Ligand binder design. Structure first.
Ligand SMILES: [Ca+2]
Ligand SMILES: [Ca+2]
Ligand SMILES: [Ca+2]
Ligand SMILES: [Ca+2]
Ligand SMILES: [Ca+2]
Ligand SMILES: [Ca+2]
Ligand SMILES: [Ca+2]
Lengths: 138, 138, 138, 138
């Protein structure tokens, strides 16, 4: 398993949508969608929210007015799995730098005293056997 | 309740302002605010700050010179209830993955020794009952 | 007293800079820096990094070629005292929604047994006198 | 060394890349890469994703087709070694306003009852040497 597991999913979405868009727009916007290789570029350009609608979406949507859905969704999904991936890094850093190291520094402190108690206990019971061996001796 | 509760709120702010925009600018920016759906689009774009100002705000502000307040507010609000949503996940995931788990492991490893303590205590007053039972017997 | 103290500071930076730019560029970029309240806009737009350079800076810098330091520094400072403020919310949220109620659950779980151990102690000294009065009573 | 150590790294990449693009695009794109401190600029602008591609890269890629790798990877690398640094601020901020304080108040609270325990044991042992000097007396 892993984080670099969404970066697979994401790089899947990235490919999924790239070809999806070559299929539609390569037709009429052959500089943006003319090949797969430009889609990849344009889709990275588009993920980076740089003249995404004004530049690309609008004039495409100019053509295929439903294209909006294609652009909007892509952005939603794309950026959103980066949020899930940006988070994956916050977590697997924020419960790694401190929380995996204390995670065991108090897993160790705590069992370093069920060790003191359970000996102290054993000590008081060799007291009870020494005392209760002197109501059986008085 | 929930954090998919601000996703309701946001998706109202978004519809509020969409109808606000359409009612206003539909008139003279009918490309952007021509329909409710048109503004729903524009405002996604404005939210993604992609030629948001140079593209939409400023030209809407030339015509309607107070629209800045509209646009700057919508941005401030919308984006702000995403910061309020983006953290709604770093929290609900950073204290759900590390700190829901330990929350019970140290809730446990503490109440596991009110066990050892309160029983070992008992052992001592059973010893105190056996010894004080032998100054009243010596 | 709080996080809104940078909000103040950042609302300072915003004001200082909006005047400095009015005094400089009002002159030749009046639409952007003509009034105070339009440098306020323009620097809201600069802060949002929307056509920031290619739309404002490049042009201002065509004219005044040291204005770069102005823009860059503003951006740096601005988005930095925001990174500073953005975090002053993850922090003031992640040790407030979890690390505040535990912070008192196990400052209280702790002091619930300096109050057991320290009763258990006496009860053991009360066994040390009643026994130490039996090497002298034997 | 730490957060400010990737600021060295980032400030490395930034430099690396600037001279590269000056040794490359200084020729044909001299507004952006004519000099060093124009690549330094353009690169800042390119980093902040302001017209990075439609403005710079796409036209640079109009000259040199492979130039794409140059801008993509700068963004990938650059923006990435800030995710790395941004996060190095939530971390070295998160477990530092709440967790460099508790990790010592709980290094302490634990150490104050190795001290309670330890003295209690001794108290039990001296209780034992007293009892065990009373099998041998009775
Ligand atoms: Ca533009
Ligand atoms: Ca149009
Ligand atoms: Ca904790
Ligand atoms: Ca005007
Ligand atoms: Ca020029
Ligand atoms: Ca050209
Ligand atoms: Ca404890």
């Amino acid at each position: 398993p892993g984080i670099a597991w969404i970066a697979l999913l994401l790089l899947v979405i990235f490919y999924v949508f790239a070809v999806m868009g070559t299929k539609l727009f390569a037709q009429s916007f052959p500089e943006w969608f003319g090949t797969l290789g430009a889609s990849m570029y344009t889709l990275f350009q588009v993920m980076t929210l740089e003249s995404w609608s004004m530049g690309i979406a609008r004039p495409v949507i100019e053509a295929y007015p439903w294209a909006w859905i294609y652009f909007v969704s892509f952005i939603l999904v794309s950026s959103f799995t980066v949020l899930n991936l940006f988070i994956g890094i916050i977590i697997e850093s924020m419960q790694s730098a401190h929380w995996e190291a204390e995670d065991a520094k108090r897993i160790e402190q705590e069992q370093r005293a069920h060790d003191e108690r359970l000996e102290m206990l054993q000590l008081i019971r060799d007291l009870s056997s020494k005392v209760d061996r002197l109501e059986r001796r008085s």
